[PDB]
Design a protein around this ligand. Structure first.
Ligand SMILES: CCCCCCCC/C=C/CCCCCCCC(=O)O
Ligand SMILES: [Cl-]
Ligand SMILES: [Cl-]
Ligand SMILES: [Cl-]
Ligand SMILES: [Cl-]
Ligand SMILES: [Cl-]
Length: 173
C-alpha cells in the first residue's frame, strides 16, 4: 500500500529560488475545501537581494455563485528544507481570501514544469485532511510529453493523481 503520509513526501532537492523566478502558468489544480483560485491562474515568482522569495498571481477567483478577476500576493518564509516554505498571502483587495499555507515545491526542472503542494490540515494518521496542489508550466500551451509523464508520477506520489482538474487560459483576466 502506498505511503500517503505528508511527512513521507519528497520535495525538490536543493531548490533554487532564482531559477524558479518568473512566469508560471497553472495547468492543473487539485482543490482544497472552499476552493479560491478557479482558472486563468498565472503566477509570477520573484526573489529579492536578501534571498526572499515572493509571488503575485492573477486569476478568476471564487467569491460566493460569483467569480471575479483578482490579483493576489504571496510572501514565502524559508524553513530548514529549501523546497518547503510558509506562504503568507492576501489579495490586493482587502476582502479577498488571506492566510498562511505551507507551500512545497514538490518537483520542478525550472524551465518547463513545476509541481506545488500544500497540506492545510493533517489527519491523525499523518495523511492530509485538506490539501491543494498546482501543476505549473512555463508555456501556457501545456507541458511536453516527457514533463507530463514526470508530473503524473509526482501527482501519484502525493496521493492526488485522480483529483486534479485542468486550468484553462482563455484571456478572461
Ligand atoms: C500555490 C499558490 C498559487 C500560486 C503561487 C503564487 C503565490 C502568490 C499569490 C498568492 C496565492 C493566494 C492563493 C492561495 C489560495 C490557494 C488555494 C486555492 O486556490 O483554493
Ligand atoms: Cl526575481
Ligand atoms: Cl525567509
Ligand atoms: Cl506522519
Ligand atoms: Cl508517468
Ligand atoms: Cl502518460
Amino acid at each position: 500500500e502506498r505511503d500517503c503520509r505528508v511527512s513521507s513526501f519528497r520535495v525538490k532537492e536543493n531548490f533554487d529560488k532564482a531559477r524558479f523566478s518568473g512566469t508560471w502558468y497553472a495547468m492543473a489544480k487539485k482543490d482544497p475545501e472552499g476552493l479560491f483560485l478557479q482558472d486563468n491562474i498565472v503566477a509570477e515568482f520573484s526573489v529579492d537581494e536578501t534571498g526572499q522569495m515572493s509571488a503575485t498571481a492573477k486569476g478568476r477567483v471564487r467569491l460566493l455563485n460569483w467569480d471575479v478577476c483578482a490579483d493576489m500576493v504571496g510572501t514565502f518564509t524559508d524553513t530548514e528544507d529549501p523546497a518547503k516554505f510558509k506562504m503568507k498571502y492576501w489579495g490586493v483587495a482587502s476582502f479577498l481570501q488571506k492566510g498562511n499555507d505551507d507551500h512545497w515545491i514538490v518537483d520542478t526542472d525550472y524551465d518547463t514544469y513545476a509541481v506545488q503542494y500544500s497540506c492545510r490540515l493533517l489527519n491523525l494518521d499523518g495523511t492530509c485532511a485538506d490539501s491543494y496542489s498546482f501543476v505549473f508550466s512555463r508555456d501556457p500551451n501545456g507541458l511536453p510529453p516527457e514533463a507530463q509523464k514526470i508530473v503524473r508520477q509526482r501527482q501519484e506520489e502525493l496521493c492526488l493523481a485522480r483529483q486534479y482538474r485542468l486550468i484553462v487560459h482563455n484571456g478572461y483576466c
